[PDB]
């Protein structure tokens, strides 16, 4: 609440009231989504022998390698747990906040 | 099991692979390696990471 | 397929999974040779045009 | 990853690893699947 549009100190600026900024959590994504160019064949990675150098990775744009790894970890493991090395911390809202 | 499971020769568990050919774009980064698996060694690519 | 959705005042997408068999078979016949054959059905990424 | 299986081919589900009443804790005796 700014009481006065004018600059400089005044009596009316004793009524200005301060509010904390909204909390913003900036971090790498879960399981490091977004670092690696998957499914971009213009930026497709290589695994090939040095004699041949013919790429054995044939990636596709209508594949979703990130989501295929997010759904795989749910099936073969406890997804609620936290593994800091692969930054494996699943995005999870609070159930009281979503459904009041 | 005693025999024929684990070697007795000087061999590393974890290897360190310097980039042969790295590149820093303003929008991306590219790193090229030599993933040299020596004789009588097997590498599961699950144990590989950057 | 004819989807009918609730209206939203924002440009939205529609992410349909056409479930296939995205299968790779990997052959390594000699030292340093890495041959792979990729095949998915029905939505194959290679036909006689390529 | 897969429930236990006998092989008589046909492929038959094996009853091993199932939970039972025991007078002694079952983890120190068997593997419970």
């Amino acid at each position: 609440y700014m009481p006065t549009i004018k600059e400089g100190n005044s009596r009316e600026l004793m009524g200005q009231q301060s509010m904390p900024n909204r909390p913003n959590y900036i971090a790498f994504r879960d399981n490091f989504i977004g670092l690696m160019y998957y499914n971009s064949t213009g930026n497709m990675g290589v695994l090939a022998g040095q004699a041949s150098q013919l790429n054995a990775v044939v990636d596709l744009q209508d594949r979703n390698t990130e989501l295929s790894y997010q759904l795989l970890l749910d099936s073969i493991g406890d997804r609620t747990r936290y593994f800091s090395m692969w930054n494996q911390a699943v995005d999870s809202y609070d159930p009281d906040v979503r459904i009041i | 099991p005693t025999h024929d499971v684990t070697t007795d020769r000087s061999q590393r568990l974890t290897l360190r692979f310097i980039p042969v050919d790295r590149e820093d774009t303003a929008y991306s980064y590219k790193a090229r390696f030599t993933l040299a698996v020596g004789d009588n060694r097997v590498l599961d690519m699950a144990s590989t990471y950057f | 397929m004819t989807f009918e959705v609730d209206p939203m005042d924002e440009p939205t997408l529609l992410y349909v999974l056409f479930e296939v068999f995205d299968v790779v078979r990997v052959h390594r016949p000699h030292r340093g040779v890495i041959e792979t054959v990729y095949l998915r059905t029905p939505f194959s990424a290679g036909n006689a045009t390529t | 990853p897969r429930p236990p299986v006998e092989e008589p081919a046909v492929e038959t589900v094996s009853p091993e690893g199932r939970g039972e009443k025991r007078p002694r804790p079952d983890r120190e005796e068997t593997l419970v699947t």
Partner: peptide, 29 residues
């Protein structure tokens, strides 16, 4: 033979199950 590469539970080599050799999981299939 390849049965001397297994730990011996007793005097018998503890061989793994034949059913654990392949994977079959997909997205609901």
């Amino acid at each position: 033979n390849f049965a001397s590469l297994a730990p011996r539970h007793g005097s018998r080599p503890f061989m793994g199950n034949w059913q654990d050799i392949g994977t079959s999981n997909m997205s609901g299939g």
